[PDB]
Write an enzyme that holds these catalytic residues in place. Structure first.
Site, PDB file in Angstrom:
ATOM      1  CG  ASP A 115      -1.882  -1.164   1.237  1.00 43.54           C
ATOM      2  OD1 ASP A 115      -2.127  -1.697   2.349  1.00 43.54           O
ATOM      3  OD2 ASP A 115      -2.361  -1.566   0.148  1.00 43.54           O
TER       4      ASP A 115
ATOM      5  CG  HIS B 123       1.351   7.179  -3.019  1.00 47.50           C
ATOM      6  ND1 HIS B 123       1.793   8.461  -3.272  1.00 47.50           N
ATOM      7  CD2 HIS B 123       0.847   7.197  -1.759  1.00 47.50           C
ATOM      8  CE1 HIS B 123       1.559   9.221  -2.215  1.00 47.50           C
ATOM      9  NE2 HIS B 123       0.993   8.478  -1.281  1.00 47.50           N
TER      10      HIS B 123
ATOM     11  CD  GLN C 202      -3.328   9.597   8.023  1.00 47.84           C
ATOM     12  OE1 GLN C 202      -4.108   9.146   7.195  1.00 47.84           O
ATOM     13  NE2 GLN C 202      -3.380   9.265   9.298  1.00 47.84           N
TER      14      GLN C 202
ATOM     15  CD  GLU D 177      -6.080  11.064  -2.695  1.00 46.22           C
ATOM     16  OE1 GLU D 177      -6.273   9.842  -2.909  1.00 46.22           O
ATOM     17  OE2 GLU D 177      -5.342  11.506  -1.779  1.00 46.22           O
TER      18      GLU D 177
ATOM     19  CG  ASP E  11      -3.953   6.075   4.693  1.00 47.81           C
ATOM     20  OD1 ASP E  11      -4.983   5.374   4.588  1.00 47.81           O
ATOM     21  OD2 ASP E  11      -3.365   6.570   3.705  1.00 47.81           O
TER      22      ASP E  11
ATOM     23  CG  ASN F 270      -4.045  23.783  -5.581  1.00 47.75           C
ATOM     24  OD1 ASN F 270      -4.192  24.971  -5.823  1.00 47.75           O
ATOM     25  ND2 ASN F 270      -4.993  22.892  -5.803  1.00 47.75           N
TER      26      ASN F 270
ATOM     27  CB  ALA G 115       7.686  18.492 -19.349  1.00 48.23           C
TER      28      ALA G 115
ATOM     29  NE  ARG H 249       2.014  24.362 -14.712  1.00 47.08           N
ATOM     30  CZ  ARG H 249       1.678  23.225 -15.316  1.00 47.08           C
ATOM     31  NH1 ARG H 249       0.763  22.433 -14.786  1.00 47.08           N
ATOM     32  NH2 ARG H 249       2.267  22.877 -16.452  1.00 47.08           N
TER      33      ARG H 249
ATOM     34  CG  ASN I 228       7.375  22.968 -21.268  1.00 49.10           C
ATOM     35  OD1 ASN I 228       7.348  21.797 -21.650  1.00 49.10           O
ATOM     36  ND2 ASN I 228       7.845  23.326 -20.077  1.00 49.10           N
TER      37      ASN I 228
HETATM   38  N1  LIG Z   1      -2.580  28.352 -15.052  1.00 50.91           N
HETATM   39  C1  LIG Z   1      -3.225  27.283 -14.536  1.00 50.91           C
HETATM   40  N2  LIG Z   1      -4.242  27.442 -13.661  1.00 50.91           N
HETATM   41  C2  LIG Z   1      -4.906  26.394 -13.141  1.00 50.91           C
HETATM   42  N3  LIG Z   1      -4.621  25.114 -13.434  1.00 50.91           N
HETATM   43  C3  LIG Z   1      -3.620  24.816 -14.297  1.00 50.91           C
HETATM   44  C4  LIG Z   1      -2.844  25.901 -14.917  1.00 50.91           C
HETATM   45  N4  LIG Z   1      -1.926  25.322 -15.723  1.00 50.91           N
HETATM   46  C5  LIG Z   1      -2.104  23.981 -15.622  1.00 50.91           C
HETATM   47  N5  LIG Z   1      -3.112  23.683 -14.774  1.00 50.91           N
HETATM   48  C6  LIG Z   1      -3.605  22.333 -14.409  1.00 50.91           C
HETATM   49  O1  LIG Z   1      -2.552  21.574 -13.814  1.00 50.91           O
HETATM   50  C7  LIG Z   1      -2.814  20.235 -14.199  1.00 50.91           C
HETATM   51  C8  LIG Z   1      -1.678  19.299 -13.884  1.00 50.91           C
HETATM   52  O2  LIG Z   1      -2.408  18.166 -13.429  1.00 50.91           O
HETATM   53  P1  LIG Z   1      -1.806  16.694 -13.608  1.00 50.91           P
HETATM   54  O3  LIG Z   1      -0.391  16.708 -13.075  1.00 50.91           O
HETATM   55  O4  LIG Z   1      -2.808  15.680 -13.082  1.00 50.91           O
HETATM   56  O5  LIG Z   1      -1.777  16.651 -15.215  1.00 50.91           O
HETATM   57  P2  LIG Z   1      -0.745  15.706 -15.996  1.00 50.91           P
HETATM   58  O6  LIG Z   1      -0.332  14.565 -15.087  1.00 50.91           O
HETATM   59  O7  LIG Z   1       0.307  16.624 -16.584  1.00 50.91           O
HETATM   60  O8  LIG Z   1      -1.723  15.184 -17.177  1.00 50.91           O
HETATM   61  P3  LIG Z   1      -1.635  13.757 -17.935  1.00 50.91           P
HETATM   62  O9  LIG Z   1      -2.908  13.045 -17.515  1.00 50.91           O
HETATM   63  O10 LIG Z   1      -1.589  14.165 -19.388  1.00 50.91           O
HETATM   64  O11 LIG Z   1      -0.353  13.107 -17.462  1.00 50.91           O
HETATM   65  C9  LIG Z   1      -3.193  20.326 -15.663  1.00 50.91           C
HETATM   66  O12 LIG Z   1      -3.906  19.168 -16.091  1.00 50.91           O
HETATM   67  C10 LIG Z   1      -4.096  21.543 -15.622  1.00 50.91           C
HETATM   68  O13 LIG Z   1      -5.437  21.092 -15.386  1.00 50.91           O
HETATM   69  N1  LIG Z   2      -2.998  19.973  -7.382  1.00 54.05           N
HETATM   70  C1  LIG Z   2      -3.340  19.524  -6.147  1.00 54.05           C
HETATM   71  N2  LIG Z   2      -4.172  20.222  -5.339  1.00 54.05           N
HETATM   72  C2  LIG Z   2      -4.504  19.779  -4.111  1.00 54.05           C
HETATM   73  N3  LIG Z   2      -4.060  18.624  -3.569  1.00 54.05           N
HETATM   74  C3  LIG Z   2      -3.233  17.827  -4.279  1.00 54.05           C
HETATM   75  C4  LIG Z   2      -2.809  18.243  -5.627  1.00 54.05           C
HETATM   76  N4  LIG Z   2      -1.980  17.278  -6.082  1.00 54.05           N
HETATM   77  C5  LIG Z   2      -1.877  16.325  -5.117  1.00 54.05           C
HETATM   78  N5  LIG Z   2      -2.624  16.661  -4.046  1.00 54.05           N
HETATM   79  C6  LIG Z   2      -2.802  15.885  -2.806  1.00 54.05           C
HETATM   80  O1  LIG Z   2      -1.630  15.239  -2.318  1.00 54.05           O
HETATM   81  C7  LIG Z   2      -2.093  14.195  -1.457  1.00 54.05           C
HETATM   82  C8  LIG Z   2      -1.053  13.087  -1.303  1.00 54.05           C
HETATM   83  O2  LIG Z   2       0.179  13.760  -1.072  1.00 54.05           O
HETATM   84  P1  LIG Z   2       1.568  12.996  -0.844  1.00 54.05           P
HETATM   85  O3  LIG Z   2       2.316  13.699   0.270  1.00 54.05           O
HETATM   86  O4  LIG Z   2       2.169  12.873  -2.233  1.00 54.05           O
HETATM   87  O5  LIG Z   2       1.083  11.529  -0.298  1.00 54.05           O
HETATM   88  P2  LIG Z   2       0.757  11.108   1.255  1.00 54.05           P
HETATM   89  O6  LIG Z   2      -0.464  11.897   1.653  1.00 54.05           O
HETATM   90  O7  LIG Z   2       0.468   9.621   1.175  1.00 54.05           O
HETATM   91  O8  LIG Z   2       2.002  11.489   2.030  1.00 54.05           O
HETATM   92  C9  LIG Z   2      -3.395  13.695  -2.061  1.00 54.05           C
HETATM   93  O9  LIG Z   2      -4.333  13.583  -0.988  1.00 54.05           O
HETATM   94  C10 LIG Z   2      -3.770  14.749  -3.098  1.00 54.05           C
HETATM   95  O10 LIG Z   2      -5.122  15.226  -3.019  1.00 54.05           O
HETATM   96 FE   LIG Z   3       3.430  13.056   2.123  1.00 63.23          FE
END
Ligand SMILES: Nc1ncnc2c1ncn2[C@@H]1O[C@H](COP(=O)(O)OP(=O)(O)OP(=O)(O)O)[C@@H](O)[C@H]1O
Ligand SMILES: Nc1ncnc2c1ncn2[C@@H]1O[C@H](COP(=O)(O)OP(=O)(O)O)[C@@H](O)[C@H]1O
Ligand SMILES: [Fe+2]
Ligand SMILES: [K+]
Ligand SMILES: [Mg+2]
EC number: 6.1.2.2
Length: 566
Positions: free
Chosen positions: A12, A14, A139, A172, A228, A314, A419, A498, A528
């Site tokens: 369990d 990640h 957590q 989540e 957890d 975030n 990237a 971003r 990009n």
């Molecule tokens: N300027 C911005 N404001 C708010 N959200 C953004 C901005 N730029 C990017 N994002 C969000 O951040 C996200 C990154 O999320 P995530 O890491 O799950 O995508 P990813 O893993 O790159 O996508 P994929 O499924 O193709 O691998 C993007 O999918 C987009 O929704």
């Molecule tokens: N863009 C995002 N906005 C808010 N929360 C996020 C985002 N990306 C990942 N998370 C949060 O990160 C949490 C897990 O964080 P991580 O520290 O990687 O694992 P763990 O909680 O097992 O230590 C998830 O609950 C997920 O919702």
């Molecule tokens: Fe963590």
């Protein structure tokens, strides 16, 4: 010292990863998923990632002064599973199997508290003497939030919040509820911009000046059938959301698609229908975190903020924290999520052994790279025709300027989810059709997901409201006047971007290409996005890159010194 930091475990778990610190420098750092090609590095020791770290540095386990793991694993086993059964030797056999990691003896094995590991990954690599530390994730062993003070190489904890009140679980669960999935919180974030908030408490949160309260869940609630609080928080949020929100949970649909020849997974509803829930969840997270950050900053008297833990990804929330009256400087590592606790555990241990940790320095390119001969070998495998351009950077500049999409695989793979010009897909930031082209025609992404820009640091001042380094694409900021109109493909619903800022030092080739680009479209800026198909992790090997390139209607692939065309 030479210290190998680790995350990932067979049960369990990640985001497995490995990090090698040599005298405080990052010798190598990579995520397991890049080698396995299985996203999120689930349920595994970081076998391949650590093999790469050692090969990169020309070391063996016998050359290590310490191995560091980014959770107090013995403690979790004792508390949640009735005992820790492994000797250090047996734990090492699991973390670093002897068939891949031959060893004369056992290196000292250190277990680092999970949030400390997070905290270490931000503080020690930020290049700042001191600051306030905010850790927010799903957590750690017990807690979901940690407030701490960082000064003179020390991290001291002021307070924690128990797991049942997790903001990451919360976010989540909302992500799962909408059909985007709990493994795709980043998508929830991008969906937020498209919706409307009406009540940022969701009738669950109560906000105050130091943080938040979750009167929805007993804060000391605990799963006695797990280690957890995910499942407990899941049941509670799902019941609550269904109670207060007009749409019931989106359901996943598994059906045979005669077009793909497979059973594919889909959603019963379009996740876009839930855009108001996303907006509201986003607003609640921001509000809650704003309180926590204000609080830790004030209690420490610092005005520099360090953020890590998964919620630290975030970027929207981060950008807004940056502009808060209570924050002058901010550092959030590209590896805020658990991928970063291997590096964090290693730093904590290295510092403890007397080392000084060097700043990251505006680069995340710590993964494998490949020589021209190695790339060519991969090209010949496929029998594809290719060229070796005299000025590759200029040719790519021209391709991009003309509206073409270019795969860019160069140097050492970046670590973290973004990237950054080592494994990227490139396109015009200036084109008002590029965004729909990539989403719809190229990558089959949801039309509502935004793209982001890379730009020279030397013109970032004029492009963006804020004049700071943004090396990692982990923060949103506002686009100055009136670039907001000049760069249609890398702007989001709310005029935010971003960005990645690029210096000549951090990425000469990429810097050079952007420079050339600028001569053609006026601005040294490009779109990009990460180089991968919809399911897979970012491509890592030259073989990975060719494979994905074959599968996507991309115009060219610039891999190493070579250019491949469609
Ligand atoms: N300027 C911005 N404001 C708010 N959200 C953004 C901005 N730029 C990017 N994002 C969000 O951040 C996200 C990154 O999320 P995530 O890491 O799950 O995508 P990813 O893993 O790159 O996508 P994929 O499924 O193709 O691998 C993007 O999918 C987009 O929704
Ligand atoms: N863009 C995002 N906005 C808010 N929360 C996020 C985002 N990306 C990942 N998370 C949060 O990160 C949490 C897990 O964080 P991580 O520290 O990687 O694992 P763990 O909680 O097992 O230590 C998830 O609950 C997920 O919702
Ligand atoms: Fe963590
Ligand atoms: K400010
Ligand atoms: Mg992507």
């Amino acid at each position: 010292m030479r210290v190998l930091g680790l995350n990932g475990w067979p049960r369990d778990f990640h985001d497995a990863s490995a990090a090698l610190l040599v005298d405080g420098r990052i010798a190598a750092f990579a995520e397991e998923e890049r080698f396995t090609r299985k996203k999120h590095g689930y349920n595994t020791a970081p076998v391949q990632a650590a093999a790469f770290c050692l090969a990169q540095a020309g070391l063996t386990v016998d050359d290590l002064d310490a191995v560091a793991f980014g959770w107090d694993l013995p403690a979790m086993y004792r508390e949640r599973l009735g005992g820790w059964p492994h000797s250090d030797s047996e734990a090492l056999d699991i973390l670093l199997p002897r068939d891949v990691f031959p060893r004369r003896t056992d290196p000292p094995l250190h277990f680092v508290q999970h949030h400390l590991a997070h905290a270490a990954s931000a503080y020690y690599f930020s290049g700042e003497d001191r600051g306030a530390v905010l850790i927010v994730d799903g957590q750690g062993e017990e807690e979901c939030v940690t407030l701490a003070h960082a000064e003179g190489g020390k991290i001291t904890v002021l307070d924690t919040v128990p797991g049942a009140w997790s903001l990451g679980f919360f976010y989540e669960h909302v992500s799962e509820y909408t059909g985007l999935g709990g493994d795709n919180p980043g998508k929830l974030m991008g969906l937020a911009a498209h919706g409307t908030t009406v009540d940022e408490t969701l009738s669950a949160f109560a906000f105050d000046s130091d943080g938040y309260r979750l009167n929805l869940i007993d804060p000391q609630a605990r799963d006695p059938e797990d280690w957890d609080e995910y499942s407990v928080t899941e049941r509670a949020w799902f019941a609550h959301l269904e109670r207060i929100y007009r749409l019931p949970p989106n359901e996943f649909v598994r059906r045979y698609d005669p077009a793909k020849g497979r059973v594919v997974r889909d959603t019963r509803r379009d996740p876009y229908e839930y855009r108001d829930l996303a907006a509201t969840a986003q607003a609640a997270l921001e509000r809650a975190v704003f309180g926590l950050a204000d609080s830790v900053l004030a209690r420490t008297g610092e005005r520099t903020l360090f953020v890590a833990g998964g919620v630290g990804l975030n970027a929207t929330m981060n950008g807004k924290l940056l502009t808060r009256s209570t924050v002058d400087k901010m550092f959030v590592p590209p590896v805020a999520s658990d991928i970063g606790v291997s590096l964090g555990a290693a730093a904590a241990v290295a510092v403890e052994l007397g080392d000084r940790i060097a700043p990251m320095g505006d680069t995340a390119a710590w993964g494998p790279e490949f020589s021209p001969d190695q790339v060519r070998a991969a090209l010949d495998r496929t029998g594809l025709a290719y060229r070796e351009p005299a000025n590759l950077e200029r040719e790519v500049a021209a391709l991009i300027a003309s509206g073409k999409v270019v795969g860019w695989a160069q140097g050492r793979g970046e670590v973290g989810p973004r990237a950054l010009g080592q494994r990227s897909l490139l396109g015009s930031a200036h084109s008002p059709t590029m965004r729909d082209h990539i989403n719809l025609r190229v990558a089959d992404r949801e039309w509502w997901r935004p793209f982001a820009p890379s730009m020279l640091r030397s013109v970032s001042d004029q492009v963006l409201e804020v004049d700071a380094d943004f090396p990692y694409m982990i923060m949103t900021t506002k686009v100055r006047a009136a670039y907001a109109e000049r760069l249609p493909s890398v702007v989001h619903e709310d005029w935010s971007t971003r960005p990645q800022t690029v210096t000549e030092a951090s990425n000469p080739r990429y810097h050079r290409m952007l420079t050339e680009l600028g001569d053609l479209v006026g601005d040294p800026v490009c779109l990009n996005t990460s180089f991968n198909d919809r399911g897979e992790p970012i491509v890592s090997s030259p073989a990975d890159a060719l494979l994905t390139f074959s599968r996507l209607p991309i115009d060219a692939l610039a891999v190493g010194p070579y250019l491949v065309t469609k």
